[PDB]
Amino acid sequence: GQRHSIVQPPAPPPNAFVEI
């Protein structure tokens, strides 16, 4: 609403259905 500490949420790469 006003501002807070650096907002940089890191998203963890999700696995895919059978990579190989």
Tokens of 2: 């006003």
Query: Determination method here?
Result: NMR
* AA identity, residue 14: P
DSSP 15: P
End-to-end Cα spacing for the chain: 44
11: phi > 0 → left, psi -120 to 50 → alpha, else beta; which?
beta
Tokens of 18: 């059978």
- Distance, CA of 11 to CA of 4 (rounded, Å): 19
Cα angle 9, 20, 14 (rounded to 5 degrees) comes to 15
**CA atoms 7, 13, 14, 16: torsion sign:** positive
- Distance, CA of 3 to CA of 17 (rounded, Å): 39
Residues written for the chain:
20
